[PDB]
């Protein structure tokens, strides 16, 4: 159940754990989901998001 990530939309902390709001490649924006940081294999996207905030 791993899927291609298009971009990181947002970031939050919930219950002490960092979560990223993801747009999934090839899926509509209605399918965007919040995922815990350890669910991601997107070092390029994460570093770009964190550098750009």
């Amino acid at each position: 159940e791993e899927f291609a990530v298009e971009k990181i939309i947002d970031r939050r902390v919930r219950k002490g754990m960092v979560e990223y709001y993801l747009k999934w490649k090839g899926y509509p924006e209605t399918e965007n989901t919040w995922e815990p940081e350890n669910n991601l294999d997107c070092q390029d996207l994460i570093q770009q998001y964190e550098a750009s905030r």
């Binding site: 159940e1 791993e2 815990p36 669910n39 991601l40 294999d41 997107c42 996207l45």
Partner: peptide, 6 residues
Amino acid sequence: QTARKS
């Protein structure tokens, strides 16, 4: 550039 979807 992938992620697990919970």
